[PDB]
Amino acid sequence: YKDDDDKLHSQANLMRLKSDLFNRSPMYPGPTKDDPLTVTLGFTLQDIVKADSSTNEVDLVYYEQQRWKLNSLMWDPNEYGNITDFRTSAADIWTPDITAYSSTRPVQVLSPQIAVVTHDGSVMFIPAQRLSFMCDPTGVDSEEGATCAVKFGSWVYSGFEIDLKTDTDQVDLSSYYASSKYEILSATQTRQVQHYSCCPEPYIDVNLVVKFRERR
Amino acid sequence: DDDDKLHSQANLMRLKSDLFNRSYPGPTKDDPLTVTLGFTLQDIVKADSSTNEVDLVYYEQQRWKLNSLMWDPNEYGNITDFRTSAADIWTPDITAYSSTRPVQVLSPQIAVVTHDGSVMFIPAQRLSFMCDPTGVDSEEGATCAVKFGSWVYSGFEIDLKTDTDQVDLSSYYASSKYEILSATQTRQVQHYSCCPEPYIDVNLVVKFRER
Amino acid sequence: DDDKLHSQANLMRLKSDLFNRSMYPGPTKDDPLTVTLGFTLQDIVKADSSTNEVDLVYYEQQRWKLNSLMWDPNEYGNITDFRTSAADIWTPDITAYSSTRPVQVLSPQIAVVTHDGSVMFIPAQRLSFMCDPTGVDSEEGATCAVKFGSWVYSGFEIDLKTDTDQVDLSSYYASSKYEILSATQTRQVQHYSCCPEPYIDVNLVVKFRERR
Amino acid sequence: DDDDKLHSQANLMRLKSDLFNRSPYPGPTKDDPLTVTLGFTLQDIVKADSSTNEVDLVYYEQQRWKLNSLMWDPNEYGNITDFRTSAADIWTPDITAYSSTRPVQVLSPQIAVVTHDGSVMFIPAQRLSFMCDPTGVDSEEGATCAVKFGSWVYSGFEIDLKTDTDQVDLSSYYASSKYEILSATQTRQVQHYSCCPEPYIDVNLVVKFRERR
Amino acid sequence: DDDDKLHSQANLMRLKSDLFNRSPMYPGPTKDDPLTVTLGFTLQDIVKADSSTNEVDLVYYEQQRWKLNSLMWDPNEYGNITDFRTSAADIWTPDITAYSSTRPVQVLSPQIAVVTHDGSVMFIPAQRLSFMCDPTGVDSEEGATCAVKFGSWVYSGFEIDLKTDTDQVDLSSYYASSKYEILSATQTRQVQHYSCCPEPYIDVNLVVKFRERR
Numbered sequence A: 001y002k003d004d005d006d007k008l009h010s011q012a013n014l015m016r017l018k019s020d021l022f023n024r025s026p027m028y029p030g031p032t033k034d035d036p037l038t039v040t041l042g043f044t045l046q047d048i049v050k051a052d053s054s055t056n057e058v059d060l061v062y063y064e065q066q067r068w069k070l071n072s073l074m075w076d077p078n079e080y081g082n083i084t085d086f087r088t089s090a091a092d093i094w095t096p097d098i099t100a101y102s103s104t105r106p107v108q109v110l111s112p113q114i115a116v117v118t119h120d121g122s123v124m125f126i127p128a129q130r131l132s133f134m135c136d137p138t139g140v141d142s143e144e145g146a147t148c149a150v151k152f153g154s155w156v157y158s159g160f161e162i163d164l165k166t167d168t169d170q171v172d173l174s175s176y177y178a179s180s181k182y183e184i185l186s187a188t189q190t191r192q193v194q195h196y197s198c199c200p201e202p203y204i205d206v207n208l209v210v211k212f213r214e215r216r
Numbered sequence B: 001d002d003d004d005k006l007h008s009q010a011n012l013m014r015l016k017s018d019l020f021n022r023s024y025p026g027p028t029k030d031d032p033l034t035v036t037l038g039f040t041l042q043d044i045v046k047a048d049s050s051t052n053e054v055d056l057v058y059y060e061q062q063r064w065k066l067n068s069l070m071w072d073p074n075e076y077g078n079i080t081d082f083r084t085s086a087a088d089i090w091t092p093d094i095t096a097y098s099s100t101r102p103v104q105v106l107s108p109q110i111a112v113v114t115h116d117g118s119v120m121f122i123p124a125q126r127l128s129f130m131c132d133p134t135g136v137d138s139e140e141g142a143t144c145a146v147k148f149g150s151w152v153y154s155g156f157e158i159d160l161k162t163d164t165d166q167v168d169l170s171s172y173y174a175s176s177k178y179e180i181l182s183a184t185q186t187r188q189v190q191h192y193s194c195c196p197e198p199y200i201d202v203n204l205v206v207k208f209r210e211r
Numbered sequence C: 001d002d003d004k005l006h007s008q009a010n011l012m013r014l015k016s017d018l019f020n021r022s023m024y025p026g027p028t029k030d031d032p033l034t035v036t037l038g039f040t041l042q043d044i045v046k047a048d049s050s051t052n053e054v055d056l057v058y059y060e061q062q063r064w065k066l067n068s069l070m071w072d073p074n075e076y077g078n079i080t081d082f083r084t085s086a087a088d089i090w091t092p093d094i095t096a097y098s099s100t101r102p103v104q105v106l107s108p109q110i111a112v113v114t115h116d117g118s119v120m121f122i123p124a125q126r127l128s129f130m131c132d133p134t135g136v137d138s139e140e141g142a143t144c145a146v147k148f149g150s151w152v153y154s155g156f157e158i159d160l161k162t163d164t165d166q167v168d169l170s171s172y173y174a175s176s177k178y179e180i181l182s183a184t185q186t187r188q189v190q191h192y193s194c195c196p197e198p199y200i201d202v203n204l205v206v207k208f209r210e211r212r
Numbered sequence D: 001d002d003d004d005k006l007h008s009q010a011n012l013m014r015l016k017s018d019l020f021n022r023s024p025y026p027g028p029t030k031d032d033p034l035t036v037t038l039g040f041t042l043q044d045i046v047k048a049d050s051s052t053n054e055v056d057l058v059y060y061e062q063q064r065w066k067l068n069s070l071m072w073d074p075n076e077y078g079n080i081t082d083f084r085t086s087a088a089d090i091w092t093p094d095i096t097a098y099s100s101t102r103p104v105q106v107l108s109p110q111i112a113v114v115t116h117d118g119s120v121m122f123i124p125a126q127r128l129s130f131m132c133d134p135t136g137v138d139s140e141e142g143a144t145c146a147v148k149f150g151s152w153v154y155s156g157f158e159i160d161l162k163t164d165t166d167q168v169d170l171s172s173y174y175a176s177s178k179y180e181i182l183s184a185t186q187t188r189q190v191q192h193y194s195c196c197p198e199p200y201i202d203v204n205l206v207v208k209f210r211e212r213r
Numbered sequence E: 001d002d003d004d005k006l007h008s009q010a011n012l013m014r015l016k017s018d019l020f021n022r023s024p025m026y027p028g029p030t031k032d033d034p035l036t037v038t039l040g041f042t043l044q045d046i047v048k049a050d051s052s053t054n055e056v057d058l059v060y061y062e063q064q065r066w067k068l069n070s071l072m073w074d075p076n077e078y079g080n081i082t083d084f085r086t087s088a089a090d091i092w093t094p095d096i097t098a099y100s101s102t103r104p105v106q107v108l109s110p111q112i113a114v115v116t117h118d119g120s121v122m123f124i125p126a127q128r129l130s131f132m133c134d135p136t137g138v139d140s141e142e143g144a145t146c147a148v149k150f151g152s153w154v155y156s157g158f159e160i161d162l163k164t165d166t167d168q169v170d171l172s173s174y175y176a177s178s179k180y181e182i183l184s185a186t187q188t189r190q191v192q193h194y195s196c197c198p199e200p201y202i203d204v205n206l207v208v209k210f211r212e213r214r
């Protein structure tokens, strides 16, 4: 029953932390040129569900791991009962506007929109998604298989406000559905920097390239 | 009688106010929670062999208990439980790990809270998930599986359990296109390379065949 | 014009007095409620033999009465009833027990409150539910059934009743792909070994065949 | 000019605050009935499904009514004679198709125009699926279908309906639709039902159509 | 650095609070305070052409640009901030609408706009649109031609004017492996008067000529 009090105190500690972080000097306005952010992206490809040769749309199911770090989300665990991290609704915090650049339907969200914040200010958010995107599956019924590609990146921030990185250029296939209609030959995820004549600012994306064929 | 009813309303409204808008940041490693899960399988509606997706309709019973939802019935005119919008309370982020479409909710999002702090919530859902129905048109049938668990909490914050490993088939639709050969619901613990925390899921395994 | 303004003020006042003043948390064992249900079947839209789902369009009349919603007309300029958004009041969680898709709502979610505290709410719905249409292409036709009832309240908090066991077919679409041979709506009471309470539903049973 | 438009902006803001607060309207009643004028502009018969007997129309429905509680004197507000407003800011009539098979899909912004005499105009564009047997659409005489529109919850004692014409506006009908329009009418009907002593009013939209040739 | 980033954050948070609260909701354009919206299309894909219903499905980015005096500030007064990103829900946006859609537009990008210190706003929603279009001849060298008008649903030319910076649709991002190739795409401002009404009506007519890729 002291165990009850210790539990009540841990709750108090976490609630205070959250109120201190979110309400005390409130909602972080997103990155700027004077305060840029790096977002790390990683894909875990679960399934190629559908490949439509009449419209050249392919549907993927994946988890997209997003990580970034804000000084405004830092705290000292010692001031809050040694709390080192917490789960919070993604609506409680700023999240990056990472967007598939060649989708053909709105992304469908398959996982709860909850993120983990750690005491150093780092945030991890892993939305599971079903995505329809522009892909010609010609060759999928061959040994060579088909190849498609889709870029992901911020919609509204240039490379001067949001930089992107990957930890590896290999997509995680370790949870790929073993009985999919389609087998994966390769899946890569590569940071690209784009440059345009009009504009001094660079544009950054991550190119997801998947080669696949009908599983015999 | 009408005045006694007026009284009972007042005590209920006061209980809800005392519990909700005068007193929870979810579970933690120091304040962990156990969620009991149980499935009642109503129908295998569709098995798509062109995409390897199967669609189920089930009721998913969720149960957990919070100290912060306890009260003494004697303080509130002998109220021992109440119904409330699921939005009024914390609910667990129990998620199918291999869904291919967002879950469609078929029932009112209302839970029952009991004076001991226990909550029961039973959403009816339609789920599309990853499943190769090959063999469904044979005597042996097809076998598929989908894991449910928290998306964001490890076993250090949320544990899971089932009251039985037998999925409840007593409301399975008798004229479904597919008959159920077996349905099981099993707590599993995953231990990892990366991480020291255990991860818990319940594995729903369905063996079925064309009726 | 002044008197139309007064009738507006009476109604605004009644509504504020009932809603933003007075505290109804739904029915309880000590303050139970009876919901009357009646169905008007408009169309069997689709019958899918590949998945055994059938799609209906109907109006579901719901009626109940709360003391907390009554008033004296003479205190409010002889107002005897009013239309209000269904979000302004408590409504029952009447649910189809064997749907396969979320219900699609076809009508405005507005109810009528009467001075004796009675409420009428008639949602028009399209429902997909579990139904094997085998026989639909035969003289005998097909038969399907779907139960409706509270999701969360047992018979000790919400009782159900019908005014008749005949589904209203007077608005059934004459050029539907399916002709209705019969449609009934019947109150049922069940027990489950889990639980000591009675459970109540209204069973909608439709017998139909392909129009010739 | 910058200051004049600062004023114009302030005056409109004031008008709206003065109207949507300051006696904030519970809809029509038998003592304070309302007439809603309806008219249809049929743009396209998109789809005719003979497997389920549902047909899909695209149209604009012009709705007009007048409330004294939305009147003002333009001279008190910088000669503002009308304004655009979110439909969520005002009362709107619950005009409903009585034989839809799916929820209506809204194709236009839900914004209305209010004029200083209290009159409102709202023109929602809609895609509607309704109960229609397309048998005969592949013939010279075509198919005929109908759908009634009216209030869901108010009788003719609270909301009366009217049309300005019984001819549906076909001047924006898509010329390369799969279906040609042979006729389209919109007719106010009064109905009486055994249940109830009060009159019920609808507008019957009747469309005669065939496959384009 | 942490304290300088704090001041920068503080300057923005204060700008966003001075603009939004403090002279709140702009009630939209009026005859006395009219607005010009510049529109441009970047056509990415013709996804589908349905000849059983005469609907065609397009994916494009629609660039919208307008300027409000109520959104201006002096950068010198706010730590030299010259622009910011904001939720499109934080601001007034124009009710620009396709006049012959057959289904609600599906939004494919974040609803976030960029506000610049001169009071200008840029908003670039990505959309999938189904519209009225007979694709007959798409399987021929001459191809099919369709057209859809874009404009305010509720404001006339007296409140909202429209303009294009160019009559050529941007095809530099058109999907190279689409089922349909683009023969041409133009975006043309049109002024109409109708006998009902004295006000001018303005729209931008998107005209796409296309055929099956071979």
Ligand SMILES: *[C@@H]1O[C@H](CO)[C@@H](O)[C@H](O)[C@H]1NC(C)=O
Pocket: E075, E076, E077, E078, E079, E080
């Ligand atoms: C902003 O920049 C201008 C020009 O470089 C300069 O004169 C002014 O001092 C700066 N103001 C600040 C940092 O507040």
